[PDB]
């Protein structure tokens, strides 16, 4: 099952919620990461993108703990072992808590997104993507929290879309993880959140698409505008 086994942020490593071994224990360890069902599928998919499973995945509950990272520095996600079939973007937004992550209500939540890679190089369908380089990398993802946004606590969502079905109607497959974070430090800026149940459309044209014929219109990145300045 492909999901988010830890995190590196201001080099120090949390431990994620580990979907193979804590959802078959009464009281799992805490974590920054929220809690999940998807034990079966691993995914979300177009029929579940007004549903709340595609907020922080399926049945997902607030992690307990938050980790500290300053505005402008570097986290890390490291991904069990991804498919190579499952070629996607990789997204990655803040919602701000406006208080406490470890009672938020999910549902109120609303993402920026901070970060996004698409299609690197479509020369040769299906094309080389933002998960074949995390796969490249070791597994591993990583995105800069933006040096002027503002000190707070937000929940922190990275996803991938495995596009591999994706020309089928609701074939997009939607693998969000959320975790709890501290900025510190920072400025004053703030992107205009949407709603996790707003994010996506079935018919939105980075969501049905084909990987498979030429790739020479490239391909547009779902998901809200990219928060820049
Ligand atoms: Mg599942």
């Given at each position: 099952h492909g999901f988010v086994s830890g995190i590196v942020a201001d080099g120090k490593y949390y431990?994620?919620?580990?979907?193979?071994?804590?959802?078959?224990?009464?009281?799992?360890?805490?974590?920054?990461?929220?809690?999940?069902?998807?034990?079966?599928?691993?995914?979300?998919?177009?029929?579940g993108y007004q549903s709340p499973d595609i907020i922080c995945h399926r049945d997902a509950k607030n992690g307990k703990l938050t980790a500290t990272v300053a505005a402008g520095s570097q986290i890390e996600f490291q991904w069990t072992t991804w498919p190579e079939s499952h070629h996607g973007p990789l997204i990655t937004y803040l919602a701000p808590c406006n208080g406490d992550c470890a009672t938020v209500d999910k549902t109120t939540l609303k993402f920026v997104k901070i970060a996004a890679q698409g299609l690197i190089d479509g020369?040769?369908?299906?094309?080389?993507?933002?998960?074949?380089?995390?796969?490249?990398?070791?597994?591993?993802?990583?995105?800069?929290?933006?040096?002027?946004?503002?000190?707070?606590?937000?929940?922190?969502?990275?996803?991938?879309?495995?596009?591999?079905?994706?020309?089928?109607?609701?074939?997009?497959?939607?693998?969000?993880?959320?975790?709890?974070?501290?900025?510190?430090?920072?400025?004053?800026?703030q992107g205009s959140g949407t709603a996790g149940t707003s994010l996506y459309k079935n018919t939105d044209p980075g969501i049905k698409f084909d990987i498979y014929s030429d790739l020479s219109g490239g391909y547009p990145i779902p998901g809200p505008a990219l928060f820049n300045a």
């Open positions: 431990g994620g919620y580990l979907v193979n071994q804590y959802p078959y224990m009464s009281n799992p360890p805490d974590t920054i990461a929220w809690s999940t069902t998807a034990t079966d599928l691993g995914f979300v998919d177009g029929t020369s040769n369908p299906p094309g080389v993507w933002a998960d074949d380089e995390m796969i490249a990398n070791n597994n591993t993802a990583t995105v800069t929290i933006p040096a002027s946004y503002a000190p707070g606590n937000y929940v922190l969502r990275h996803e991938i879309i495995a596009l591999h079905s994706a020309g089928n109607l609701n074939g997009a497959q939607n693998y969000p993880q959320c975790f709890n974070i501290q900025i510190t430090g920072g400025g004053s800026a």
